[PDB]
Amino acid sequence: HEYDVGKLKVEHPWLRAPADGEKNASFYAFIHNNGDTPDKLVAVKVEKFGSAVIHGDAKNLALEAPVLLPPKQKITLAPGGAYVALLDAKKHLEVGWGLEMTLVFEKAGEVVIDAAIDAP
Ligand SMILES: [Cu+2]
Numbered sequence: 001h002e003y004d005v006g007k008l009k010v011e012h013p014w015l016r017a018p019a020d021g022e023k024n025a026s027f028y029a030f031i032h033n034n035g036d037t038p039d040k041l042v043a044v045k046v047e048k049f050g051s052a053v054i055h056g057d058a059k060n061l062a063l064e065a066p067v068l069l070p071p072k073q074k075i076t077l078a079p080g081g082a083y084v085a086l087l088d089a090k091k092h093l094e095v096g097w098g099l100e101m102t103l104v105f106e107k108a109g110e111v112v113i114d115a116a117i118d119a120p
Helices: none
Strands: 002-005 008-016 025-033 039-045 049-055 067-069 074-077 083-089 098-105 109-118
Touching: 002 109, 008 098, 025 039, 025 067, 039 049, 067 074
Parallel strands: 008 109
Antiparallel strands: 002 008, 008 025, 025 074, 025 083, 039 067, 039 098, 049 083, 098 109
């Protein structure tokens, strides 16, 4: 599944459900900038988590930094690379359901998505 906003496409947003005992999750997606002007993923809003921290600099995965989206390029958020940390889960996440999230882009603005929840 995929979502479009402006000239951006967010393809198969997904995450691995927290392991039993853990309250944190890692959010992943394949983001395309199909436009001629740059953009940035600057925030993520999720009701089921206390906060969301964008780790968009693949060279330094401990830094809180937006995901830069240069024109005409595909940026992948994936395990072992850039990702969004979802911190302080409020209820248990059901594998097979979606996690409803709002992505906030600097120029293209907000888009409401459903992330596919995988087993731990
Ligand atoms: Cu999908």
